[PDB]
């Protein structure tokens, strides 16, 4: 018999992105080649099958630094991290291949789906 | 020029509630009289003006235990904590006064609004 506030989930995510922008309560740095990205482990796990696996691991759960595979493109990661915190994906002709490869590695199935559909339309 | 995934914010919140249920990465206990509630500080701040103020404080941000005012009803808090993590509010005749008082203390304006509207309809 609950009532539901339609905008609540969006409002929560907006405030989680505000916390990320202000670097409040961030508990991990994701290292992608020469670049570093601060984030909240809980948000990363909620969005990515890869981070969900990493941070449920009894040893990796306590690491303050995670290094991604050297093949991972920093811009692709940046675009996906922005998506995690906003629901918005900056998908462009010049970045689609890097975004799809990063989304496959991060196990973000909905992003992979759409990248596949956008590539298929251009061929 | 971003595209947006409609269900992303809801999916994030569902996974944050799964983390809470499994007690993964919870970093605070909220004490309400004889009862204890584990939660994630980031979610509490994202939902509540009171917790936003508490956890931006340079000393309180590091506390693992927060004690609420003894006038706060544990069931009212439980209902509001469930709402924070799900967007669903279990508002009933028998709990509405406790829910509204807890929502006022926690500075959860949308919940206060609706409690006011539901009480006005019954008078």
């Amino acid at each position: 018999s609950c009532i539901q506030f339609t905008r609540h989930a969006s409002d929560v995510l907006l405030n989680l992105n505000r916390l990320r922008s202000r670097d409040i309560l961030t508990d991990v740095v994701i290292v992608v080649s020469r670049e570093q990205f601060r984030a909240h482990k809980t948000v990363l796990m909620a969005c990515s099958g890869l981070f969900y696996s990493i941070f449920t691991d009894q040893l990796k759960c306590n690491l303050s630094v995670i290094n991604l595979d050297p093949e991972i493109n920093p811009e692709g990661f940046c675009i996906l991290l922005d998506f995690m915190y906003t629901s918005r994906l900056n998908l462009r002709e010049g970045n689609i291949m890097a975004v799809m490869a990063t989304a496959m590695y991060l196990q973000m199935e909905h992003v992979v789906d759409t990248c596949r559909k956008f590539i298929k339309a251009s061929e | 020029s971003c595209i947006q995934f409609t269900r992303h914010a809801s999916d994030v919140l569902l996974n944050l509630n799964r983390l809470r249920s499994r007690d993964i990465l919870t970093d605070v206990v909220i004490v309400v009289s004889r009862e204890q509630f584990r939660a994630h500080k980031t979610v509490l701040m994202a939902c509540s003006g009171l917790f936003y103020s508490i956890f931006t404080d340079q000393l309180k941000c590091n506390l693992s235990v927060i004690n609420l005012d003894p006038e706060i009803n544990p069931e009212g808090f439980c209902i509001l904590l469930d709402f924070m993590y799900t967007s669903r509010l279990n508002l009933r005749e028998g709990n509405i006064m406790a829910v509204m008082a807890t929502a006022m203390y926690l500075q959860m304006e949308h919940v206060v609004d609706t409690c006011r509207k539901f009480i006005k309809a019954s008078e």
């Binding site: 609950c2 009532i3 539901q4 506030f5 | 669903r88 509010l89 949308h110």
Partner: peptide
Amino acid sequence: WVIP
């Protein structure tokens, strides 16, 4: 607010 809605009836979900």
